[PDB]
Amino acid sequence: KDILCRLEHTTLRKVTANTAIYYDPNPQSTVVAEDQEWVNVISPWLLRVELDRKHMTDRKLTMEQIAEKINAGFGDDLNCIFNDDNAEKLVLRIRIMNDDDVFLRCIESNMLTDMTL
Amino acid sequence: EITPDLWQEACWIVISSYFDEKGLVRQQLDSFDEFIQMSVQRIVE
Amino acid sequence: QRIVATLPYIKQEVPIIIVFRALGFVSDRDILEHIIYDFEDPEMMEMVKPSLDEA
Amino acid sequence: LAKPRQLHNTLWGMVCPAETPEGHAVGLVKNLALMAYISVGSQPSPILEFLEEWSMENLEEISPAAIADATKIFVNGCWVGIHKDPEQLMNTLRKLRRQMDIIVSEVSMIRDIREREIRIYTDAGRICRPLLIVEKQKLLLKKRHIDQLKEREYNNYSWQDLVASGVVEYIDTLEEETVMLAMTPDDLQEKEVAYCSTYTHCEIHPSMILGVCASIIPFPDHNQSPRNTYQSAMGKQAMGVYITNFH
Amino acid sequence: RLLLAALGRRELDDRDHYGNKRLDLAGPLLAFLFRGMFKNLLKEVRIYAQKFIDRGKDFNLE
Amino acid sequence: PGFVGIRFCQECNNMLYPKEDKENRILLYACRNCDYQQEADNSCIYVNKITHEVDELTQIIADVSQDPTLPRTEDHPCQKCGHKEAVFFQSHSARAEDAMRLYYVCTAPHCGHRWTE
Amino acid sequence: NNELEPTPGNTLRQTFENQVNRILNDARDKTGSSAQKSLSEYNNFKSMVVSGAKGSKINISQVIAVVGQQNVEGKRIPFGFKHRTLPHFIKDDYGPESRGFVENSYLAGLTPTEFFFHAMGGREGLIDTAVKTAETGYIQRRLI
Amino acid sequence: MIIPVRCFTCGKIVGNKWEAYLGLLQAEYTEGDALDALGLKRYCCRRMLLAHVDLIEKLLNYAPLEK
Amino acid sequence: PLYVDITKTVLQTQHQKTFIGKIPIMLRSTYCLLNGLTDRDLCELNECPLDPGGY
Ligand SMILES: [Zn+2]
Ligand SMILES: [Zn+2]
Ligand SMILES: [Zn+2]
Prior knowledge:
Chain I: This is DNA-directed RNA polymerase II subunit RPB2. The structure is cut from a larger assembly and holds two copies of chain A, five copies of chain B, one copy of chain F and one copy of chain H. Chain A is built from six helices and four strands, in the order ααβαβααββα.
């Protein structure tokens, strides 16, 4: 099954559990108010995705590998803040460095479709 | 009232009455008579 | 993810919102109130937003 | 294209199952079953007058937001109006259909309660068959009625007179889809270990699902279906005295 | 209806449903054919009357 | 979380799009047809639940209890009105029949109570 | 009551239909084995099938013991009506009788519902035969 | 259209027995007992005296156009 | 045979019973000759009483 998961195609569409965007101009204070905001402490809006432990256990994935994969895919334009495995919930937070949130929606649709992680 | 044992003959005579009333070409005759009775005058009006 | 229409004597695929505006309903409010009956439809929000946000 | 010439579920009592041509076109040609009858079609204007003399408002006068609660009412597909409570007006329409006062027996009505709507079909092209009407656990086809039917040709008691009595009614495809059926009054409507005990309509006779050739086919419950189909096809080749005045 | 179809809360339709198929008898067929060729007959009658009114003579119905 | 609805420009009966205010780092639903602005009530502007766990209890209406084609049961009574007779049925919606779940609606009129065991 | 634990590799619905198919196949196989054990050795059916002229040991089972479950398109008979195979059954039931398994034999006779299901099977076989003959004729012509 | 004179299997005389059969059924006997009273023991003759249909009354109900 | 009446207004003129053409009728219809005739009448008219008709 290791060779299985190495061979079979995985997409962020089938790995994500949910996604959202929150306008948080201050990086220190967020609507989610999780520990990862203090772990982190420039886009005024942040993109938060929440995964599912069923799929991480099925695919044997390390979300550090997902984070480095998406960092390599989108370059240095997007920074990803990762939720360390303290509970069932794992959150990736995406912030853009220097068009607008409609372009953010387009690129999150793109990464949902075909990063081929 | 209704008897389960006589229900066979009851439904059979119901079938007999239904076929005696209708026949087999009821839908053909009814469609043609409806057309020639109202549809042609509806067309010409 | 949008919605268009195929119509007789028409060679194009015209959007529903601009069809409604050609009919006369240029208001987003009565367009929404004509496309839905029970107003509390957020799932309708994320599956209708590209069509009106285009048209 | 296999699917449109495949045999569909929606054929109980409309077309006999084991009567097909054998050659290049198997399944595109059907032969009509016994009870199956085609709707002749009628004008829906008296029906709309019934709605409007009743309390089912048109779509142009009704306020928009107070369409969320109500149920939609379509006639022959096109949208007519809405009403808050389809209950007791569905029953009024059913009994008026039974008595043929203004709603005819031929015009049908389907009440989608899963999605709040109801459609009235006056159109031709619908195919229907007669079925019994049962309200309680007991049926409506009484010994008095079968006594007049047995003493037919004297009282001139007719099948149309039975329909006027409202014991039986025409049931078409969408209504058959949305109604529950009782297969046997002597076996299913009788009180026993209950299956659902919500029986609404009952079939006249199961053999009536057969057709013109399947009727002369003996023991199809014992025969094989390819044999039954072959025999039903060969019934047209069955040679005999074709007409009375052949000379 | 299309939105509920996309959501899948409402089940899609089948072309094989004989409830969703209608059955034309000879009545609608003959009515449609007679309608079309009666329109053709009216075309012939109107072009005949137009020919006579171009000729300046009264049209003959028969 | 929860879904976020349309902000309406009331005076011309139109849509409001969220745009940012950089002078105080806030979010403002502004009209594009005209000039009408409202404060953003929450940081969430867009959210997508991908797990498709929707409240089928709210999706199901109570009028289905009187349907005779649906089967009738008496094992579990109504919680609010105490009536023994309930109707057990399935989702009847797509992407749900993978898990066949039972929903009971009480046959007693004027209570309209539905629940899942 | 959802005590069913889904098999890995398929959904709960597929696991359930696999369980139903396994149970029905085992029951039908046991029925046929019991009948062929008890064919009493003076049956001309047995004699001719042992000669190998025509028929099969399963054909004795349909003609004598039980018809069994009939399959359309490699599965059970689907819900042609509103989540029901027939209006004669209730909504949302998964009984073998309501889904296409025949509990009777040819000698016992059939209810009209399972007779309709056998008609489903026979029509499926006949349409397969017709399209098979036509396509193999065209393919043989192509090869020649 | 007519009763056959002889049994297809046997050859026993049948033609008079049809009109006799009609006479006994008008005299209101059960048809099997009337058949036995006429004396048709074998079923291969019982069949033709039992389930014969007559058409010549309809044919003669038609007018003779060749006169 | 089929007729219509004609209303012309050139001065109003009425032309009743104007022959259009001949339209086919299937047997045993409400306007057929074989309507209401019993078995005796039909066999006198040398047609089969048991024939269904409608063609
Ligand atoms: Zn505005
Ligand atoms: Zn209750
Ligand atoms: Zn003999």
